[PDB]
Design an enzyme around this catalytic site. Structure first.
Site, PDB file in Angstrom:
ATOM      1  N   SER A  63      -0.471  -4.829  -0.109  1.00  0.00           N
ATOM      2  CA  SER A  63       0.553  -5.174   0.874  1.00  0.00           C
ATOM      3  C   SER A  63       0.067  -4.934   2.299  1.00  0.00           C
ATOM      4  O   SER A  63      -0.855  -5.609   2.768  1.00  0.00           O
ATOM      5  CB  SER A  63       1.841  -4.385   0.621  1.00  0.00           C
ATOM      6  OG  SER A  63       2.969  -5.134   1.045  1.00  0.00           O
ATOM      7  N   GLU A 104       6.432 -12.087  -6.155  1.00  0.00           N
ATOM      8  CA  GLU A 104       6.212 -11.305  -4.944  1.00  0.00           C
ATOM      9  C   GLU A 104       7.510 -10.991  -4.209  1.00  0.00           C
ATOM     10  O   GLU A 104       7.623  -9.929  -3.587  1.00  0.00           O
ATOM     11  CB  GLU A 104       5.249 -12.043  -4.013  1.00  0.00           C
ATOM     12  CG  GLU A 104       3.804 -12.044  -4.484  1.00  0.00           C
ATOM     13  CD  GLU A 104       3.121 -10.705  -4.274  1.00  0.00           C
ATOM     14  OE1 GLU A 104       3.695  -9.844  -3.577  1.00  0.00           O
ATOM     15  OE2 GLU A 104       2.006 -10.517  -4.805  1.00  0.00           O
ATOM     16  N   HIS A 135       6.557  -7.020  -6.627  1.00  0.00           N
ATOM     17  CA  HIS A 135       5.499  -6.658  -5.697  1.00  0.00           C
ATOM     18  C   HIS A 135       5.149  -5.181  -5.831  1.00  0.00           C
ATOM     19  O   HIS A 135       6.029  -4.317  -5.813  1.00  0.00           O
ATOM     20  CB  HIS A 135       5.948  -6.975  -4.270  1.00  0.00           C
ATOM     21  CG  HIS A 135       5.039  -6.441  -3.208  1.00  0.00           C
ATOM     22  ND1 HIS A 135       3.959  -7.148  -2.728  1.00  0.00           N
ATOM     23  CD2 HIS A 135       5.059  -5.272  -2.525  1.00  0.00           C
ATOM     24  CE1 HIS A 135       3.349  -6.436  -1.798  1.00  0.00           C
ATOM     25  NE2 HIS A 135       3.996  -5.293  -1.655  1.00  0.00           N
TER      26      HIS A 135
END
Ligand SMILES: NC(=O)c1cc[n+](CCCn2ccnc2/C=N/O)cc1
Ligand SMILES: NC(=O)c1cc[n+](CCCn2ccnc2/C=N/O)cc1
EC number: 3.1.1.7
Lengths: 540, 540
Positions: free
Chosen positions: A200, A331, A444
């Site tokens: 991320s 995601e 995610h």
């Protein structure tokens, strides 16, 4: 004792600790100071190297977590609190960790360097899901991870001034890389084979080090998991970063009315405020009600980033570079419970057509009503425009493509077409112990526990297939760290992982099944974000 | 002496002719005058009914074809010559034809009325592919077809004036429908069960009669094949129709040098020119290079059409009406050889990426460069953006969806959601004798020969399966003409044809295989044309 739990680095001596794994012990040196504590007059300033110390510094436990916001959306929930700080908060937090195999490697060993995510507002190297004892034992690699300042302490920027230049959190990471170049040999690591990998905001940080000349010489490979520097959330403009820093100052009484104004008085007033006071007003400087947007992120200032990440990626020459990029299957689902109307982890989030239209504005803020309609057109199944289930996964795709998948695909294509060796993946295994609801799929951040071999923990309830799957993933990451190619060097037994190119756009799926080659990382959806929508925003 | 070949109508007596079919004879009455010849001062004027005659008008052969452009793109080619006039050109062309079974039906029989297509610039009821002897013999219905003025003689319009009011070609069709009400009973036809069916511009004509109150009372059902009144080619504005009529006058020398140019002086000068002179300058009045655009089409004037077709469709109440709509598989491929760069019927038309980008501007004229970008975005396979074959099928989809498929789906959905029972189809069988190249697939207009039972002609080389397939389609069309339902009323054996609804959007595929139900008439593509693109043009 253990003779190998004592190590001398350039700053002094350290004492580590032995960690137990089902496969053998690992020597860990947790909490190594690599910078002077950025406290008092040093708040918002770039880090300085840690001055040498006398005696033996205890390196047997993780140090303090950098001051950051604590998630309170679902108190007591495993899915959210696994990312919350597990050590006490402090501005004295610039410490790094080193895992090395037992016995210590006698020859230089490749080095993996982890950079945690957390939207540049949170995260810590001490989280249980970042435990590097299984990756180091199973692959005999050297693993390093550092803490870097997040939030205002790391990225509050008054561009131009010397009191708050911004990007000091990225400089924290760079200093830790300079520390790795000067001291990883003492642990048996090869400073000529350093492979950065992050997730991320950490993946975005790894990408910004590719685009920064002073950082580029400190590593040789890069892995970007579910993140890219060119995303709509990873950077902010000079004018906008100034407005937020001024707004945060206003919320904490800076400057004292009506004395003050310039950047010197503003930062001086901010330095007197307690750290918790600044954190308590961090989210109140964002421009809109939105998801996947963060207050204090890297700023495009002309120093650390000579231009925007998009500009530097297009004009970059990446010959002699190996990159491993990828995403998870879903995601956007994690971020929908943080603002999208009608969403809740405790029901099935079967949103209505109206809630979908409202969520598009939350997922895609600061776009014209025409731009939002273009998003609605592309993500609406017009044979079932009212089906709540399809609308739920549609908004998840909107947030995931706009923020992760398409920024990553654009980077992977430009890198491969400009000299870099690129490997792409999609993570499609939902952990058997996942606490998030089933409708989120593979959210995610939930490939990290398999990269770090957490299923191998005997105190956890993973399946036997997930343990074998975790070892296969650790093999991929280590082979890429050693050779630059995730395929086993002398092994056509398992199917090969073809590189990613701007033309073929090949990637592999990562799940319990053997490798399966596919083409295009949502090529049709990402053409809308990367090609058409910018033209639509130009002609407002 | 066969007394069946002698019929008296409201204007006088007629003598028909017996036509042979492999299944039995048919009585045909070809060339019945239904209007005064619109010649001299009657050019551009609405039709007037044919004054009664003395004696026996010979109705044994087709009358003259209305003055029209003759296709010269491929001289001697069957695929183009089959639409060219097969009788002498003349302004004295307002004649109609009636087919009736032998022996003549004693009970009132439902009537099919055919309206040929041809972009309102060409066409004739005398074409071999419109032969009604097989449809009338196999299904024992009454088939009627008329000639109507095309080109400038039918649709040149100076709106407001009385000398060239426009839409007189549509009024020719209406007068022929009034003739059916007053005379089809003499042939055994039931004037209370009249079903209209037309193709392309004929289908658009059938649609405009639904939206015109004076015409709506003259029939009960409607069939629209590969055409709709709301397409971007079927209508034109008052200002543009005046500009085209004025430039046509200029191209033929009207008005003379030093003459006032009001509407009366302009039409009077146009009435003195030979008909061939006006035809020889018809295509020289289109605003720009384009395909699927025609010079003189129905004008939105407030008379025949009180508002635009789209406005009338949205605000229309269609309760008590049954409609049969449909398209062919490849609506756009036939028009690409008429201007799209790189296309040729004599090679594979493997166009390049640049030719595709240039062809989009020809297939979609008068759109902003931003609008063209959105078209390229939707119709580019971004995993194979340069594949010549895919770009060929893409531009074929661009022209086919923009002009036929999506205007029809828009119409079909609004009709079903506002009271009408609608049936939809997609014709997917390519004739075994088709002379067009293979890459055109099922081109526009090549379902007609199967609707009219042309495969049953013994002098043709159709297959045995195509003869059975042609009988299925004639049964479908006849069942709809009789009952308003293409399904067999005495049969649950065959696969059923479900109605088309605005929600389920069900249609059937028409080919040699049994009926197959599908959903959505290119729903994702048509949402771009029907929903998004109008928003893009309003914001420019
Ligand atoms: N104080 C508040 O009311 C508040 C609002 C929003 N947030 C944003 C939560 C973090 N977030 C935003 C979008 N996605 C995320 C999840 N990150 O893990 C935090 C606090
Ligand atoms: N004289 C000329 O250069 C000329 C130009 C265009 N045309 C129009 C051809 C017909 N057409 C064009 C686009 N689609 C069609 C339909 N053909 O059936 C004819 C002649």
């Amino acid at each position: 004792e253990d003779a190998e739990l004592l190590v001398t680095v350039r700053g002094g001596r350290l004492r580590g600790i032995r960690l137990k794994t089902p496969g053998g012990p690992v020597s860990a040196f947790l909490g190594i100071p690599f910078a002077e504590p950025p406290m008092g007059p040093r708040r918002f300033l770039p880090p300085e190297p840690k001055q040498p110390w006398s005696g033996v510094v205890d390196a047997t436990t993780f140090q303090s977590v950098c001051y950051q916001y604590v998630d309170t959306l679902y108190p007591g929930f495993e899915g959210t609190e696994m990312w919350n700080p597990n050590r006490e908060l402090s501005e004295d937090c610039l410490y790094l960790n080193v895992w090395t195999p037992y016995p210590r490697p006698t020859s230089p060993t490749p080095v993996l360097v982890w950079i945690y995510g957390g939207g540049f507002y949170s995260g810590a190297s001490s989280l249980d899901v970042y435990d590097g004892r299984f990756l180091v034992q199973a692959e005999r690699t050297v693993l390093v991870s550092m803490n870097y300042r997040v939030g205002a302490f790391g990225f509050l920027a008054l561009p131009g001034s010397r009191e708050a230049p911004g990007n000091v959190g990225l400089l924290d990471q760079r200093l830790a890389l300079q520390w790795v170049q000067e001291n990883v040999a003492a642990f048996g690591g090869d400073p000529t084979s350093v492979t950065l990998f992050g997730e991320s905001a950490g993946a975005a940080s790894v990408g910004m080090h590719l685009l920064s000349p002073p950082s580029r010489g400190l590593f040789h490979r890069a892995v970007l998991q579910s993140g890219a520097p060119n995303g709509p959330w990873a950077t902010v403009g000079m004018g906008e970063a100034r407005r937020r820093a001024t707004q945060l100052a206003h919320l904490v009484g800076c400057p004292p009315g009506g004395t003050g104004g310039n950047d010197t008085e503003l930062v001086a007033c901010l330095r007197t405020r307690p750290a918790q006071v600044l954190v308590n007003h961090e989210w109140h400087v964002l421009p809109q009600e939105s998801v996947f947007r963060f207050s204090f992120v890297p700023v495009v200032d002309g120093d650390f980033l000579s231009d925007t990440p998009e500009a530097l990626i297009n004009a970059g020459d990446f010959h002699g570079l190996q990159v491993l990029v990828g995403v998870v299957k879903d995601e956007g689902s994690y971020f929908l419970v943080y603002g999208a109307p009608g969403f809740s982890k405790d029901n099935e989030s079967l949103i209505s057509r109206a809630e979908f239209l409202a969520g598009v504005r939350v997922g895609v803020p600061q776009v014209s009503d025409l731009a939002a309609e273009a998003v609605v057109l592309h993500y609406t199944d017009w044979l079932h425009p009212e089906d709540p289930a399809r609308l739920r996964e549609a908004l998840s795709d909107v947030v995931g493509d706009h923020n992760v998948v398409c920024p990553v695909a654009q980077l992977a294509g430009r890198l491969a077409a400009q000299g870099a060796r690129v490997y792409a993946y999609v993570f499609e295994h939902r952990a058997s112990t996942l606490s998030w609801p089933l409708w989120m799929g593979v959210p995610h951040g939930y490939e990290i526990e398999f990269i770090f071999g957490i299923p191998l923990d005997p105190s956890r309830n993973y399946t036997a297939e997930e343990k074998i799957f975790a070892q296969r993933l650790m093999r991929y990451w280590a082979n890429f760290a050693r050779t630059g190619d995730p395929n086993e060097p002398r092994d056509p037994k398992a199917p090969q992982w073809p590189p990613y190119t701007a033309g073929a756009q090949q990637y592999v799926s990562l799940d319990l099944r053997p490798l399966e080659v596919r083409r295009g990382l949502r090529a049709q959806a990402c053409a809308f974000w990367n090609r058409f929508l910018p033209k639509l925003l130009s002609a407002t």
